[PDB]
Amino acid sequence: MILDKKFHGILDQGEGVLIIFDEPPVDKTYEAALETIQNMSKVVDSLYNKAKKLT
Amino acid sequence: NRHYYSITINYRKNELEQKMLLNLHKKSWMEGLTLQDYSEHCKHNESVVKEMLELAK
Amino acid sequence: AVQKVVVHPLVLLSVVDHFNRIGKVGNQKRVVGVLLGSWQKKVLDVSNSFAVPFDEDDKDDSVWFLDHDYLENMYGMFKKVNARERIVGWYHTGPKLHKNDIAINELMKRYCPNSVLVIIDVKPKDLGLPTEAYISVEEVHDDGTPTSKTFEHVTSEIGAEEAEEVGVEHLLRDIKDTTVGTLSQRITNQVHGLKGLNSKLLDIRSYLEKVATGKLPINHQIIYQLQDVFNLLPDVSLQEFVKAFYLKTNDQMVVVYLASLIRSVVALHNLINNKIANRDAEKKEG
Lengths: 55, 57, 286
Prior knowledge:
Chain A: This is 26S proteasome non-ATPase regulatory subunit 11. This is part of a larger assembly, with chains A, B and C. Chain A is an all-alpha fold. Chain A has 1 helix and no strands. The longest helix of chain A has 29 residues, at 26-54. Chain B is mostly helical. Chain B has helices spanning 15-28, 37-44, 49-56. Chain B is elongated and about 65 Å long. By secondary structure, chain C is of the alpha/beta class. In chain C, 43% of the residues lie in helices and 15% in strands. Chain C has 7 helices and 8 strands, in the order βαβββαβαβββαααα. Chain C has helices at residues 9-18, 69-81, 101-110, 164-172, 183-212, 221-230, 242-283; strands at 4-7, 32-37, 44-46, 49-51, 86-92, 116-118, 133-138, 149-158. In chain C, the strands form 2 sheets. In chain C, strands 3-1-8-7-6 form a 5-stranded mixed β-sheet. A 3-stranded antiparallel β-sheet of chain C has the order 4-2-5, with helices on both faces. Chains in contact: A-B, A-C, B-C.
């Protein structure tokens, strides 16, 4: 059920320690990663226009 | 314009109106102690502005 | 009763008129003006005001000169032309609070309702807010002193409703609006230290002076709350706030990525037009 990611939790065998945690700011790294990936194509296309106009 | 004309208009301002009215308007756009509403935005950058940053992105 | 008040700059510019129509006589005493406003709503809103002949004595401070016929005539004509505003209180231009103000305000306490008091400065050299709303209410003291008139500070704001913003903005043509960005923010972030430095530094001198060289008890009970609030921040070791510095620093990293990436997007049109325009203008110039 933890592998199904229905709630926050993790098991343990040696010590049996139960830890529950969460990461609320999810919409930050997704939008940032999309901006980086989308801008990489912008810089590469710019290098294609300059590389085409120069050589 | 027939039988009906106008005249020019100019203004005048002394130093008392300049400093009293200028400082009064700057204070009208400023705070009381000038240190109150700064930490409000400085600490709202982590609570409310994050939504404006996500929408901005 | 009243949490906040609204004072328009028209009454303070009427004090500018009080300083304009003096005539160079050499008196420039605390001219008392009859403050007008709207006491109906919980919030106080001053629209305009007028003046009353007020003269004191040089030696004796208990001398105060008011007028009832002029107040009833100006209030009668002003109420006839505009019945939406009535008498609320008064105000004096004197920077010092004299003892006679209980007798001056007591008249408008008997005849008129609870009057608000405003202390301003004769010279526009004070950087702080010149308007301070002081309500005239009697408070019970814990030490056992007899009940007397107490001036409690009520917060005030300087705002204009419809037209005075347009008139002031047109007459100045030098002040700037909010204009969120670099300059309007960095100016506050540079001069704010002086905005608090002149006030706090100007207050701690007379404070520390009246601590040792003070008499006539000034309600020392409030000083315990003064130093108590001063000691409500006992130099925290910032141990728990480290993660908060990681969050704010992470937002700083987000601003770094937005600056570098967005400016990198802006560099497209410049770093392309600089080539395609110069090479075509050069190859086609002659």
